[PDB]
Design an enzyme around this catalytic site. Sequence first.
Site, mmCIF file in Angstrom:
data_model
loop_
_atom_site.group_PDB
_atom_site.id
_atom_site.type_symbol
_atom_site.label_atom_id
_atom_site.label_comp_id
_atom_site.label_asym_id
_atom_site.label_seq_id
_atom_site.Cartn_x
_atom_site.Cartn_y
_atom_site.Cartn_z
ATOM 1 N N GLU A 18 0.005 -4.746 -7.783
ATOM 2 C CA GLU A 18 -0.653 -3.596 -7.140
ATOM 3 C C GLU A 18 -1.582 -3.935 -5.958
ATOM 4 O O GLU A 18 -1.936 -3.074 -5.161
ATOM 5 C CB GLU A 18 -1.440 -2.852 -8.201
ATOM 6 C CG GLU A 18 -0.553 -2.357 -9.298
ATOM 7 C CD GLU A 18 0.266 -1.172 -8.873
ATOM 8 O OE1 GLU A 18 1.088 -0.706 -9.670
ATOM 9 O OE2 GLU A 18 0.092 -0.686 -7.747
ATOM 10 N N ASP A 24 0.075 4.951 -1.377
ATOM 11 C CA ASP A 24 0.900 4.011 -2.089
ATOM 12 C C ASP A 24 2.305 4.090 -1.503
ATOM 13 O O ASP A 24 2.508 4.751 -0.495
ATOM 14 C CB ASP A 24 0.862 4.292 -3.584
ATOM 15 C CG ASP A 24 1.638 5.534 -3.962
ATOM 16 O OD1 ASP A 24 1.748 5.829 -5.169
ATOM 17 O OD2 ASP A 24 2.189 6.188 -3.057
#
Length: 164
Positions: free
Chosen positions: A11, A20
Amino acid sequence: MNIFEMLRIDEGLRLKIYKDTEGYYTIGIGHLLTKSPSLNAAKSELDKAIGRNCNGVITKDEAEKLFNQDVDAAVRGILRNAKLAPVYDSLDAVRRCALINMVFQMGETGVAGFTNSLRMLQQKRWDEAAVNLAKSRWYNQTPNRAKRVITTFRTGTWDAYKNL
Ligand SMILES: [Cl-]
Ligand SMILES: [Cl-]
């Protein structure tokens, strides 16, 4: 290697609000804030999550706290899920992390839709599950990550993460 280190590699860590891979507002260590295209909605969700006026920026400790909450939530979520718990219980330690990884990324609902792959994992047919797992949007949209997790399910080792 452990689940935190694993997800920390997949991540990344960003202290400012960001989009994202799906274009959704997120912060810290993959902590999704909202699916709304609105940045204000995002900042509002942020303040609420943290408990202060952040103006879209958080400290490393704040990121780590969300992260601790998110990993706990995922595990607890898996354990509560009729479809996931039995698979999770069937797996060894390293492979359990791979399952947690998927749930953290896609949600318990999403992962629960991988019916066929789940049966395969339960049955310990590693190679066959890996092939099935790859026939997914998930793999086509985030291939490097998917490959790492898949390799993890296949081998039961951390090799996909060693050297990163
Ligand atoms: Cl496909
Ligand atoms: Cl990727």
